[PDB]
Ligand binder design. Structure first.
Ligand SMILES: [Ca+2]
Ligand SMILES: [Ca+2]
Lengths: 27, 73
């Protein structure tokens, strides 16, 4: 068992990053 | 570095994550969004993320917990 406390954070952080890059069209 | 200020954005993600619109994110609700967003997660993988965010130990992610998870390193 590794827990994945850091990795688990990336899974959620990355998921939100895409949502912003998609929603935040800017132009 | 910008986490506490993310509230403006972190608050928008809630309405998008909370399909029930009750103000609480469960393990089935979160995994549901991950699928559409383009992320495959198992029932165990998701449940592990809920506990990490669940500060009250009820099995649901609230606003105070949402920011914490986002502002967690
Ligand atoms: Ca809900
Ligand atoms: Ca809770």
């Amino acid at each position: 068992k590794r827990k994945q406390e850091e990795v688990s954070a990336i899974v959620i952080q990355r998921a939100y990053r895409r949502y912003l890059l998609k929603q935040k069209v800017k132009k | 570095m910008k986490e506490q200020d993310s509230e403006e954005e972190l608050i928008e993600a809630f309405k998008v994550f909370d399909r029930d619109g009750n103000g609480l994110i469960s393990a089935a609700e979160l995994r549901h969004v991950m699928t559409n967003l383009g992320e495959k997660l198992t029932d165990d993988e998701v449940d592990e993320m809920i506990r990490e965010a669940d500060i009250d130990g009820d099995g649901h992610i609230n606003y105070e917990e949402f920011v914490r998870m986002m502002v967690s390193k």
